[PDB]
Design a protein around this ligand. Structure first.
Ligand SMILES: CCCCCCNc1cc(NCc2cccnc2)c(C(N)=O)cc1[N+](=O)[O-]
Length: 294
């Protein structure tokens, strides 16, 4: 490294290998993501560079975009743990409701900020939500999906998780809206509460059908235009909707109400991050300190 010193391999992210590294000059510790494949579209360089200006306390800071030796590296502020690991660690006892609420509230503030700046995440998942010892949680990888248009894979054949994908994406809609992020966050909220993924599909159709089996197969009444979507098939089985009381027990009615609005089928009916922040569920929100073992 011309200015870094690898501390260790943090993982093999969706867009390449990630290392924890120390800037030999500043001494700062950062996350360095090597971007995957053979060309690096200058279009992406400009778009990514724009994200360097997207600063908010609940968004992982993109410190630098390094395009040298015809390679692309993203330098991000470093956080010690992701929500997936934290949820697994809290599996026996569950994350306390006050902390679940604090995290959801913070994540919505982060989304409201990005969305007001016309930046979508598109691939939110527990592994992309980073936490620290202060009780903060931050969204990582905002805007990379668009800047890199197509997703595909990482670089070492890894199974893309579809668990948090909004139904309009699964039905082949080519135009994503801010609503896809609200859907993903709703799925994560449910998972924090129950300690089980809400819709753990293992294929695109299994993902879609798991959603239908829980929320009911969508129709023109609840989702105008759904039957004209690219991958919609009249042959889809028609399942009845289940009650949220059975989906995320023992979450209270304020929580079920908010989740239901985050999971509406019609992206246009789905609650916005700004509106969600005003939901009665957050009347008593606080910022607890999590028990983090690093
Ligand atoms: C099995 C762990 C999966 C990590 C995959 C890489 N995922 C990332 C994880 C991060 N930190 C949380 C963390 C997690 C584990 C160890 N140490 C720190 C960070 C960051 N900004 O600090 C960035 C990325 N990433 O995507 O650039």
């Amino acid at each position: 490294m011309e200015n870094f010193q690898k501390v260790e391999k943090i993982g093999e992210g969706t867009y390449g290998v990630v290392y924890k590294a120390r800037n030999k000059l500043t001494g700062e510790v950062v996350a360095l993501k090597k971007i995957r494949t053979e060309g690096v579209p200058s279009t992406a360089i400009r778009e990514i560079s724009l994200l360097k200006e997207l600063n908010h306390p609940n968004i992982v800071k993109l410190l630098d975009v390094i395009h040298t030796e015809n390679k692309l590296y993203l330098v991000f502020e470093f956080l010690h743990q992701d929500l997936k690991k934290f949820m697994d660690a809290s599996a026996l006892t569950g994350i306390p409701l006050p902390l679940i609420k604090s995290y959801l509230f913070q994540l919505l503030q982060g989304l409201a900020f990005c969305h007001s700046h016309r930046v979508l995440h598109r691939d939110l998942k527990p592994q992309n939500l980073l936490i620290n010892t202060e009780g903060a949680i931050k969204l990582a990888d905002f805007g990379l999906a668009r800047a890199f248009g197509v997703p595909v894979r990482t670089y070492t054949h890894e199974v893309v998780t579809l668990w948090y994908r909004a139904p309009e994406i699964l039905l082949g809609c080519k135009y994503y809206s801010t609503a896809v992020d609200i859907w993903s966050l709703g799925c994560i909220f449910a998972e924090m509460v129950t300690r089980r993924a809400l819709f753990p599909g293992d294929s695109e159709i299994d993902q879609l059908f798991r959603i239908f089996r829980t929320l009911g197969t969508p129709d023109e009444v609840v989702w105008p235009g759904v039957t004209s979507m690219p991958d919609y098939k009249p042959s889809f089985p028609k399942w009845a909707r289940q009650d949220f009381s059975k989906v995320v027990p023992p979450l209270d009615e304020d929580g079920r109400s908010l989740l239901s609005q985050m999971l509406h089928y019609d992206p246009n009916k789905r609650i916005s991050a700004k509106a969600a922040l005003a939901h009665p569920f957050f009347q008593d929100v606080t910022k607890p300190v999590p028990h983090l073992r690093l």
